Amino acid sequence: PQITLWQRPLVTIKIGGQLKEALLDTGADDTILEEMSLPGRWKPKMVGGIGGFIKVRQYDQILIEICGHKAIGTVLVGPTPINIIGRNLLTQIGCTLNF
Amino acid sequence: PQITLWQRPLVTIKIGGQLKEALLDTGADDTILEEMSLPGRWKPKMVGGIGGFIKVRQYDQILIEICGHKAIGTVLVGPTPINIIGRNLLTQIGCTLNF
Ligand SMILES: CC(C)[C@H](NC(=O)[C@H](Cc1ccccc1)C[C@H](O)[C@H](Cc1ccccc1)NC(=O)OC(C)(C)C)c1ncc[nH]1
Numbered sequence: 001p002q003i004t005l006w007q008r009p010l011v012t013i014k015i016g017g018q019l020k021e022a023l024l025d026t027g028a029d030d031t032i033l034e035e036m037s038l039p040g041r042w043k044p045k046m047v048g049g050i051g052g053f054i055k056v057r058q059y060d061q062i063l064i065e066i067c068g069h070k071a072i073g074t075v076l077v078g079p080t081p082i083n084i085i086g087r088n089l090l091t092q093i094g095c096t097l098n099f
Numbered sequence: 100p101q102i103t104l105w106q107r108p109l110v111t112i113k114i115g116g117q118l119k120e121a122l123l124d125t126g127a128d129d130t131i132l133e134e135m136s137l138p139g140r141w142k143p144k145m146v147g148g149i150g151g152f153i154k155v156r157q158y159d160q161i162l163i164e165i166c167g168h169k170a171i172g173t174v175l176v177g178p179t180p181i182n183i184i185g186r187n188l189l190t191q192i193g194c195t196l197n198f
Contacts, residue, residue, distance in 0.1 A: 098195055
């Protein structure tokens, strides 16, 4: 679909049976979700934005559906203020930026 | 142009007769530039990202050309890791997300 940026680009995603709102972020290299339980083994990582760095748990090969499109990739879980779908899964659904 | 997201969406912006590289960020409500000298008065702003909040200086009605498109708006200057073109200027050059 075409999405305007007059308003923040929030979409419903489905992860582990749970439905959630997530921000489509082209400034985000990786996808970061708010604290949750994901199966499998994770490794620790430190990621930085405005304001600095936060510690997250990295899970690889997690399947997530973004508006009906299935996508699989690394998902970071940690104390993020909002769920963010980064470039690593935006490319998988064919998302591009146009003007 | 159509920009895919396999790489970070970086463009050249011209501000103050100077060229710089900035990130097109749909996840940023505002535009934040690394420390620089801009004309006029400024007023204070608190902005929060993934690592918490930073205090920045707000300048209004600044001309900035993003890929040969002249935009005129609010630019925040402060301790950002990278120059960020936010939604307030991405809407003025007609940018949308498509998949
Ligand atoms: C973990 C992701 C989110 C992170 N990117 C961001 O935080 C980018 C900026 C950046 C890019 C590249 C290197 C450093 C900083 C900004 C995000 O788009 C964030 C997403 C967000 C929205 C709402 C609340 C909290 C966060 N937007 C954001 O911080 O907005 C402002 C206006 C403060 C710039 C990233 N990408 C690469 C390294 N870190």
